[PDB]
Design a protein around this ligand. Structure first.
Ligand SMILES: COc1cc2c(NC3CCN(C)CC3)nc(N3CCCN(C)CC3)nc2cc1OCCCN(C)C
Ligand SMILES: Nc1ncnc2c1ncn2[C@@H]1O[C@H](CSCC[C@H](N)C(=O)O)[C@@H](O)[C@H]1O
Ligand SMILES: [Cl-]
Ligand SMILES: [Cl-]
Ligand SMILES: [Zn+2]
Ligand SMILES: [Zn+2]
Ligand SMILES: [Zn+2]
Ligand SMILES: [Zn+2]
Length: 272
């Protein structure tokens, strides 16, 4: 059985780079049960605050690399280095909110605080995994702290999420009324990223063209150096697995697996 290229670009030209789809495992064609979108969509009135006068913004007359950048200060500091990668000191456990520069800033569109809004730069592939359906892998080495892709989908209310049958593609935007990104019907490449118990990417809340704090955009950055061919994955969290472990178990394969049939059996036994 050969590896076949089934789609030259699942994004249909909407990303900076093509994202091909291949299958070397089984006879499944390229997934078509969803609509690919490169940016979040709305299917109801969300009333996002898009008032330009409500934007906090910088007065920077340089490239925004000084500690005088208001946008950086909103993030404690700008966390991007000269090549757009998170600093080694970045809090990978409890990430701060990132405020990127925006249309109200005095700075230029190429300033040092515009990583997420510049879109996908790394080379990714949608591929058929052995045991986890479709997944997303790197076609190249990716240093720690590199922006990968955004978690994109349909913005829905908590109450709408509570009525959705298929909850397998939900990303929660928790706050203190709350919202979800549902990637089931409308999503980007991130909808295909599997759970790994030892993750190589972390989600980060970012603000760009608006600063309505109810609607952070979710940016995945590598949490360590990623090798060519390595499957991308993040921790779906204990909530997902509480609901789902009764239906299927984790196939991540890691010695550190917390959600496999074996690991679940050890915990059920260790309970006695
Ligand atoms: C199965 O994984 C998740 C399920 C749900 C879920 N599920 C059900 C919807 C249909 N009803 C009948 C029962 C609940 N509801 C909600 N929310 C939003 C916040 C809390 N609200 C009070 C409840 C509505 N969030 C979820 C988040 C999930 O994983 C997120 C991480 C993994 N992603 C990245 C793949
Ligand atoms: N570690 C893991 N073990 C087993 N199945 C997983 C997994 N991570 C993700 N999945 C599967 O993928 C769903 C999340 S959506 C991720 C893409 C999915 N593999 C697909 O083919 O479309 C989960 O509900 C589960 O069905
Ligand atoms: Cl094609
Ligand atoms: Cl409102
Ligand atoms: Zn600035
Ligand atoms: Zn700037
Ligand atoms: Zn700015
Ligand atoms: Zn696992």
């Amino acid at each position: 059985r050969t590896e076949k290229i089934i789609c030259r670009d699942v994004a249909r030209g909407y990303e900076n780079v093509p994202i091909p789809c291949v299958n070397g495992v089984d006879g499944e064609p390229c997934p078509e049960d969803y609509k690919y979108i490169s940016e979040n969509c709305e299917t109801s009135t969300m009333n996002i605050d898009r008032n330009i006068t409500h934007l906090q913004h910088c007065t920077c007359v340089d490239d925004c690399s000084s500690s005088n950048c208001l946008c950086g200060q909103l993030s404690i500091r700008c966390w991007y280095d000269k090549d757009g990668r998170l600093l080694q000191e970045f809090n990978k456990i409890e990430p701060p909110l990132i405020f990127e520069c925006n249309q109200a800033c005095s700075c230029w569109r190429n300033c040092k605080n515009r990583v997420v809004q510049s879109g996908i730069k790394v080379r990714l592939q949608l591929y058929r995994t052995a045991k986890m359906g479709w997944g997303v892998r790197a076609l190249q080495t990716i240093p720690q702290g590199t922006f990968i892709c955004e978690y994109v989908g349909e913005l829905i209310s908590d109450a709408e999420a509570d009525v959705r049958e298929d909850d397998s593609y939900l990303f929660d935007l928790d706050n203190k009324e709350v919202y979800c990104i549902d990637a089931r019907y409308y999503g980007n490449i991130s909808r295909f990223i599997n759970h790994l118990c030892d993750p190589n990417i972390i989600p980060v809340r970012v603000f760009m063209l608006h600063q309505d704090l109810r609607f952070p955009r979710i940016a995945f950055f590598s949490s360590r150096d990623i090798r060519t061919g390595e499957e991308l994955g993040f921790d779906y969290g204990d909530r997902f697995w509480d609901i789902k472990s009764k239906y299927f178990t984790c196939q991540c394969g890691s010695e550190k697996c917390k959600h496999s049939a074996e690991a679940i059996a050890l915990e059920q036994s260790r309970l006695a």
